[PDB]
Design a protein around this nucleic acid. Structure first.
Ligand SMILES: Nc1ccn([C@@H]2O[C@H](COP(=O)(O)CP(=O)(O)OP(=O)(O)O)[C@@H](O)[C@H]2O)c(=O)n1
Ligand SMILES: [Cl-]
Ligand SMILES: [Cl-]
Ligand SMILES: [Cl-]
Ligand SMILES: [Cl-]
Ligand SMILES: [Mg+2]
Ligand SMILES: [Mg+2]
Ligand code: NA
Length: 328
DNA sequence: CGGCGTACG
DNA sequence: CGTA
DNA sequence: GCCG
């Protein structure tokens, strides 16, 4: 079992679901307390279990697995012995965990804001709604639409949405393309949002594209919220049709030049942990700096000109993983 | 012990 | 600060 | 919290 998640295939569904869920609760709780190192270890340990070929049934099967030390091993041991881990259950039922989870789930609220509200004594969404002068416009939209945004986006919703985006994109810039990325490209059947990557086959034509796209979507009445109602990423709330009505859904749009498209596609297809691990691997094992724009050799001061995701994996000395195996 | 991904709005 |  |  290699130490980096980008070195091993991780499928969407696996053989250790309950164990990984429990470790991800501890990871999440670590993040709510600002303990980024512990969050990473618990996320990595959970991801190792997702990559195993069969269920863990005995503690000895953790021997030699990376990212399993005394703490994560004890969590697994208790789950194996009793079906429950006391530390995990104590987190689950704690007021701090439940409120931080509720608040950070709001679009426009991060850990730092949630924590401040928590220390001010706030606990429920209706607490926040009662003091709306404390809220940014982004947070007001996230709170108003919170109920719809808490319901999963279905993969069967995505194609109709993509067609609507493609219509606006084609009027903004004929020939520009829309590619589904994020969790749905990794094979998820449901998601929290839809992530689209936009480009154009003629380098430079994509300059200034996203404002034109957003203005067209807003003119069609489809945008319930966006930040601009020059930029290259938009985080918006979209009106999605429903039987006799509609629902709010989160849609992310990003524009990249076609020269960068492999890097952007890789960078936006995820998972989030896979990307963190891939960039850590690149820098720490290969001495190369990776982001969603490119891959930089700081000694030569040169950028690698990739034509595909396959190119990028090869340049990093990694076996290619299709999106479905990037579910770290 | 240091390090923990890297951007954009 | 928020967002991916 | 864990790895190198
Ligand atoms: N911090 C981050 C957050 C996001 N990303 C990248 O952005 C993509 C969409 O994130 P996203 O937030 O839409 C989560 P997704 O994987 O699509 O599943 P979901 O929407 O059903 O929950 C991820 O797959 C990563 O490639 C990242 O590199 N670093
Ligand atoms: Cl920490
Ligand atoms: Cl409607
Ligand atoms: Cl590609
Ligand atoms: Cl980036
Ligand atoms: Mg997504
Ligand atoms: Mg997204
Ligand atoms: Na949030």
């Amino acid at each position: 079992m290699p130490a980096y998640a980008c070195q091993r295939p991780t499928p969407l569904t696996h053989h250790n679901t309950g164990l990984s869920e429990a470790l991800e609760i501890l990871a999440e709780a670590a993040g709510f307390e600002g303990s980024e190192g512990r969050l990473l270890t618990f996320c990595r340990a959970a991801s190792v279990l997702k990559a195993l070929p069969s269920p863990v049934t005995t503690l000895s099967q953790l021997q030699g697995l990376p990212h399993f030390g005394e703490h994560s091993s004890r969590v697994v041991q208790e789950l194996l012995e009793h079906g429950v881990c006391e530390e995990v259950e104590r987190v689950r039922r704690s007021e701090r965990y439940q409120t931080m989870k509720l608040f950070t789930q709001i679009f426009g609220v991060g850990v730092k804001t949630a924590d401040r509200w928590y220390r001010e004594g706030l606990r429920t969404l209706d607490d926040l709604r009662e003091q709306p002068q404390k809220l940014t416009q982004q947070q007001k939209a996230g709170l108003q639409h919170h109920q719809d945004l808490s319901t999963p986006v279905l993969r069967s919703d995505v194609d109709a949405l993509q067609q609507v985006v493609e219509e606006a994109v084609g009027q903004a810039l004929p020939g520009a393309t829309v590619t589904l990325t994020g969790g749905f490209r990794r094979g998820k059947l449901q998601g929290h949002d839809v992530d689209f990557l936009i480009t154009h086959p003629k380098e430079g034509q994509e300059a200034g594209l996203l404002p034109r796209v957003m203005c067209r979507l807003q003119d069609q009445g489809l945008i319930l919220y966006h930040q601009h109602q020059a930029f290259e990423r938009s985080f918006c709330i979209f009106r999605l049709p429903q039987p006799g009505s509609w629902k709010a859904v989160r849609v992310d749009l990003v524009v990249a030049p076609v020269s960068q498209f492999p890097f952007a596609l890789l960078g936006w297809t995820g998972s989030k942990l896979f990307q963190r691990e891939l960039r850590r691997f690149s820098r720490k094992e290969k001495g190369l700096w990776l982001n969603s724009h490119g891959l930089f050799d700081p000694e030569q001061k040169t950028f690698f000109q990739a034509a595909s995701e396959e190119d990028i994996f090869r340049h990093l000395g990694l076996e290619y993983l299709p999106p479905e195996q990037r579910n770290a």
